[PDB]
Every structure is written in C-alpha cells, then in structure tokens.
C-alpha cells in the first residue's frame, strides 16, 4: 500500500526510473513502435468525428499496446524485476 | 511461504511499474503525433482556402 | 506587446495559435507546463531546444509557477509565425496535398483534402480549381504550378 510509495519514490531518486524509461524508449523506437502509434493516431482521426485529446487516446491505447513485441516486454519486465529484487527487504 | 509472499508482491509490482512506464511513453508519442497532425491540417486548410478563392 | 502583433496576424493565424494551445491545455486553465509547451510549439511547426524553451518560461513566469500563460504564448508564437518562410510553407503544403507522392496534385488528392477539411464542393468545381491553374495542360498541378497559385497572394 504505502511501501509502494516508498519504492516508487526511491525509484526516481536513484535515477533508475530514467534508466528503465530510456531503455523502454530506445527499444520502442528500434522496433518501429513510434511510427505505429503515429499511424494508429492518424488513422483513428479520419475514422472519427472527434478531435478530443482524451477520447482518441482511449481508442488508440488498447491497439498500440498489443503491437509491443514480446522481446521488448520481456526485457523491460526483467529489468524492473531485478531492480525490485535488490530493494524489497531480504 | 514468506518467500512466496515476497515473490507475488514483486511480480505484481513489476507488472504495475511496466504498465505505467509504457503508458507514459505512449502518452508522450501521442502528444507529438497530435502536434504533427495539427500542423498538417493547418497547412492544408490555409492553402486549400487560398486556392479555392484564387 | 499586444496590438502591433494582432494587426499583422491574419485571423486564421490567430485561430491556429489559440487551437494549438487549447489542444494541450489539459487543465483548461490557460497555462501549460514544459512538455505541453514543447508540443504546442511543435503544433505550430517550431522545434526549440530545451535551453530556449526553459528560458522562455523563465522569461515570462510572472508567478514562479514554471508554467506559460496563454497570453504570453500568443505573443511569442505570434512573432515567430510572422517570421515564417512563406515558400517553405507552400512546399510542405504541397507534399501534404500530394499524399500518394506522384509529384502532382490530382483530382483524387484535392478531393481527399476537401473531404478532410469538411469542404462541400462539386466534382465540377474541384476540376475548375485545377483547370483554372494548370499551366502544363497535363490535367494536374505540379509544385511550380502550385507555388504559382500560392505566391500570387
């Protein structure tokens, strides 16, 4: 509950938030995902009446997440797990 | 058992941290994407109207 | 400096500024933080480095809040819009009409842009936009023919 706040607050101050975040983005760029999100956003705007920032995001989000490769998912998951392991008491 | 409880908490929190990181990254790329499309729409609009009134 | 700017901005340019801010004012509070400002400027075709964005916020930060007010954004972006290279604008617009990249704007393209802008036009009057400015006689509009349209002003 509140140990999570302590872990998430340590996450940022250690700089490990930024390491993981940067690894996630490098890998997402490398596999083409940035262009896929862009296509998904563009495509979803022609199919829709709405310009609404939040509304279009909520249609793009589910579809975008399924396009993330198992390799990127597994490598970042593994990286976060190893950081948690080193921090959560014995 | 004490080790089982530790694992399940780590597994649950790994998944949660990952879903947040990923969501933040999607959010940022999306913002950019909207910025680009906005610009493109503005240009088409300006020069289409200029043309039509020419 | 309010007044001298919005006498020389076109109404469509003032809408552009307003719409680009509103899109990323998630708060609807007339203020933007750093990442919001970055993308708002990008919505107007301006890519600034971190240093300039930070310095822009710090320059106009009337309240120590590290945000940018709509009225200051309007002034800063108004000046940059006025300094746009018109010819570079026309050329980007051209690539955007020619979205199948044949190097010419066809009736297919022009009709597609019209439908995107919600513009309701006859097929015959879309033909007239090309027919009236087709210097080749080739039935379509190339970059030069298009630059000629947009340069007439």
Residue numbers in the entry:
A (entry chain C): 6 to 95
B (entry chain B): 752 to 805
C (entry chain A): 9 to 161
Publication text:
The yeast Sac3:Cdc31:Sus1:Thp1 (TREX-2) complex facilitates the repositioning and association of actively transcribing genes with nuclear pores (NPCs)—“gene gating”—that is central to integrating transcription, processing, and mRNA nuclear export. Sac3 is the central component of TREX-2 and contains a conserved Sac3/germinal center-associated nuclear protein (GANP) domain, which, along with the short N domain, binds both Mex67:Mtr2 and Thp1, a factor involved in transcription elongation. A region within the Sac3 C region (Sac3CID) binds Sus1 and the calmodulin-like protein, Cdc31 (Fischer et al., 2004). Sus1 is also a component of SAGA, a large complex involved in chromatin remodeling and transcription activation.
Crystals were obtained of Sac3 residues 723–805 and 753–805 complexed with both Cdc31 and Sus1. The crystals obtained with Sac3723–805 had a pseudotranslation in which one half of the asymmetric unit was shifted by close to half the unit cell, which makes structure solution more difficult because this effect greatly reduces the intensity of half of the reflections and so reduces the amount of data available. Therefore, we first solved the structure of the crystals formed with Sac3753–805. Three different crystal forms of Sac3753–805 complexed with full-length Cdc31 and Sus1 were obtained by vapor diffusion. The structure of each crystal form was solved using a combination of molecular replacement and SAR (Se-Met) phasing. The model based on the 2.5 Å resolution P21 native data was refined to an R factor of 18.8% (Rfree 23.5%) with excellent geometry and contained Cdc31 residues 9–161, Sac3 residues 753–805 and Sus1 residues 6–95. The N domain (residues 18–91) had the “closed” conformation (see Yap et al., 1999) and the C-terminal domain (residues 95–158) the “open” conformation, similar to that observed for Cdc31 bound to Sfi1 (Li et al., 2006). The Sac3:Cdc31 interaction interface involved primarily the C-terminal domain (EF hands III and IV, residues 95–158) of Cdc31, with fewer contacts observed between Sac3 and the N-terminal domain of Cdc31 than were seen with the Sfi1:Cdc31 interaction (Li et al., 2006). Sac3 Trp802 appeared to be central to the interaction and becomes buried in a hydrophobic cavity in the Cdc31 C-terminal domain formed by the side chains of Phe105, Met137, Ile138, Phe141, Ile149, and Ile157. The Sus1 fold was based on five α helices (helix α1 residues 8–19; helix α2 residues 21–36; helix α3 residues 38–49; helix α4 residues 58–70; and helix α5 residues 75–92), separated by flexible regions of varying size, that were arranged into an antiparallel hairpin structure that curved around the Sac3 helix.
